């Protein structure tokens, strides 16, 4: 004899999709609104379990992308719209104490603004980077995003420093983390562990170099949905970090302008001191060692005796051609041609000249710009280049060389390097099984 028997609480899960809330231990990302995470995180190791993970078909990355976009929009909503700034500027070239690397990069633009009184004007000057002004045909210039989008001043109290956030699944759901240290990103994972929250992912915004990310453990990892495919970005995760030192040597002064009742526009006053180009430093020996390690783990998919070449970005906007990031409140676009200028066959610091943009078209959305307010003083930054976003050049000629060039732009690839090991599953605690019992 044998009959059904129902068990409640059995460890059975199915892959599913749900809303993952935030837990943390002002800011653009509402860290304060997040629930307080437990001081001692709980993680249960699972024995003799195999689950098929897929970093590229993951859904948590899409939710994180939507969440970051929503947080950006909700932080830029209650602050100053700069529509009066879209006016004909009369600009010259700044030449007082400028080096050879910044010849004409900054413009001294004088223009008329509305004052707090509606019927009175105001002739006020400011300093605009060459990338934020386009000529109209001293000369006449206008802000670059005045014929495509409306600018909203990044409102000076909010901070852009990425505070780590933990993505916690609701009750009735769990998150399987793939603890396998040789997990390439797509396939079965012998070592699965159940958790409730993620490991404090930093919403770092960068394009060519993954900054302040989570490192691998065993060796440098090469992840791609299809290495053979050339339309798929190759994520590279370093086992040891490469320190990058970022700096904006200019000593900027912020100047407040009354463009209306209560509304204030923060312009760049005269730079006190010497004007020097913003730049990045990366250890040459460390970078060469890391590139060699990457090539060593990159020849596996292409075989031995192949030539691995790193060249700079092949084209596109300033976001994809240059390593773009944000720190100290300022947005840097660094020409990483020195980094990827190498060929590999089977104390010195590389200096990357960076440019600064204030009219920021974040999240590649045409119709919503953002003016980053000037940051007082001199900005210095120290970051970890945790990973790379490479792209393989297509075609196949007689030569067997492969050229990998930095990519990016799509922040989904940036946030997929932190949610690769994580998967969200829905528990099914009801289960039927045979047993020899009956109700009396």
């Amino acid at each position: 004899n044998l009959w059904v028997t129902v068990y409640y609480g059995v460890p059975v899960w199915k892959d599913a999709e749900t809303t993952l809330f935030c837990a943390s231990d002002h800011n653009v990302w509402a860290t304060h609104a997040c629930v307080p995470t437990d001081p001692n995180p709980q993680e249960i190791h699972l024995e003799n379990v195999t689950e098929e993970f897929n970093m590229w078909k993951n859904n948590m990355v899409e939710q994180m992308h939507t969440d970051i976009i929503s947080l950006w929009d909700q932080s830029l909503k209650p602050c100053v719209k700069l529509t009066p700034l879209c006016v004909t500027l009369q600009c010259t070239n700044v030449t007082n104490n400028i080096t050879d690397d910044m010849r004409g990069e900054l413009k001294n633009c004088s223009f008329n603004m509305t004052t707090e009184l509606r019927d009175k004007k105001q002739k006020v000057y400011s300093l605009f980077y060459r990338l934020d002004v386009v000529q109209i045909n001293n000369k006449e210039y206008r802000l670059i995003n005045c014929n495509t989008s409306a600018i909203t001043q990044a409102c000076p109290k909010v901070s852009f420093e990425p505070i780590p956030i933990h993505y916690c699944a609701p009750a009735g759901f769990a998150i399987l983390k793939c603890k396998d240290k040789k997990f390439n990103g797509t396939g079965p994972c012998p070592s699965v562990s159940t958790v409730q929250c993620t490991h404090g992912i930093k919403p770092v915004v960068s394009t060519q170099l993954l900054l302040n990310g989570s490192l691998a453990e065993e060796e440098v990892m090469i992840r791609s949905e299809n290495i053979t495919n050339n339309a798929k970005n190759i994520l590279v995760q370093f086992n040891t970090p490469v320190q990058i030192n970022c700096t904006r040597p200019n000593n900027n002064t912020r100047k407040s302008i009354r463009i209306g009742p209560g509304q204030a526009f923060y312009a760049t006053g005269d730079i006190i001191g010497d004007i020097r180009q913003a730049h990045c430093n990366v250890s040459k020996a460390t970078w060469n060692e890391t590139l060699g390690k990457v090539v060593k783990q990159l020849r596996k998919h292409f075989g031995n005796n192949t030539i691995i070449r790193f060249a700079n970005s092949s084209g596109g906007d300033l976001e994809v051609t240059t390593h773009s990031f944000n720190c100290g409140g300022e947005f840097f676009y660094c020409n990483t041609s020195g980094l990827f200028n190498s060929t590999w066959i089977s104390n010195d610091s590389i200096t990357l000249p960076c440019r600064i943009k204030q009219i920021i078209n974040m999240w590649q959305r045409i119709g919503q710009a953002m003016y980053a307010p000037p940051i007082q003083g001199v900005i210095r930054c120290v970051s970890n280049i945790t990973g790379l976003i490479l792209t393989r050049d297509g075609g196949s000629t007689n030569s067997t060389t492969e050229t990998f060039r930095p990519g990016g732009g799509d922040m989904r690839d940036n946030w997929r390097s932190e949610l690769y090991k994580y998967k969200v599953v829905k528990i099914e605690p009801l289960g039927v099984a045979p047993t020899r019992c009956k109700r009396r």
Partner: antibody
């Protein structure tokens, strides 16, 4: 989904030809655009692709350096410029739209633009 | 790269045809077949070697998973005279020309 190309062109050797490709009927941000050239009486050959979203490009190793692809979202066009033209570049150039990044799926093709390079 | 064979073949109307697509690298199922009519731009028929693009009649079918792929059209028709192209990612293949006997 319609991809209208540009007009048949004749260039002298050593000059640069800029073809265009206007795309309409679909959101010009989600689908990558490839340029596939075909010599007379020869098989299809891939030149390179461009992502209209941010202008990211990827050129074939055979045409690298001689080719440059740009996009213009306002007029909704993708342009491809070929430099240092030589005799064997006489071909018909098509602009295809890839549906999914995996399983390259050139759904819609342009009418084609024959570039004739001759003296 | 592809090694699509044969270069051409003469086939009577209604006869079954086969087009081998012997590849040189692991292509899995990401191989598509294009039909280019004489002069007209190429048109896609089969993607992923099994699925059929909408608007294509069901006589076309594909097969293969490894380095070998097959393309069949079952009942040939007068409007099926064209060139047929393999396509794995970037690389296309040498075309197969159909000629009515």
């Amino acid at each position: 989904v319609r991809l209208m190309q540009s007009g048949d062109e004749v260039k002298k050797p050593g000059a640069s030809v800029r073809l265009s490709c206007k795309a309409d009927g679909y959101e010009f941000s989600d689908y990558f655009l490839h340029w596939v050239r075909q010599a007379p009486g020869q098989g299809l050959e891939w030149l390179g692709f461009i992502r209209p979203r941010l202008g990211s490009v990827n050129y074939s190793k055979r045409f690298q350096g001689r080719i440059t692809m740009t996009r213009d979202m306002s007029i909704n066009t993708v342009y491809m410029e070929l430099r240092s033209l030589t005799s064997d570049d006489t071909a018909q150039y098509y602009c295809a739209r890839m549906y999914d990044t995996d399983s390259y799926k050139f759904d819609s093709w342009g009418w084609g633009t024959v570039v004739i390079v001759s003296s | 790269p592809m090694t699509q064979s044969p270069s051409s073949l003469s086939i009577s109307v209604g006869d079954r045809v086969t087009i081998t697509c012997r590849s040189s690298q692991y292509a899995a199922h990401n191989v598509n077949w294009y039909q280019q009519r004489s002069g007209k731009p190429p048109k896609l028929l089969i993607y992923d070697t099994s699925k059929l693009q909408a608007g294509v009649p069901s006589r076309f079918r594909g097969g293969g998973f490894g380095t070998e792929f097959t393309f069949t059209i079952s009942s040939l028709q007068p409007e099926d005279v064209a060139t047929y192209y393999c396509q794995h990612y970037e690389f296309f293949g040498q075309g197969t020309r159909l000629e009515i006997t």
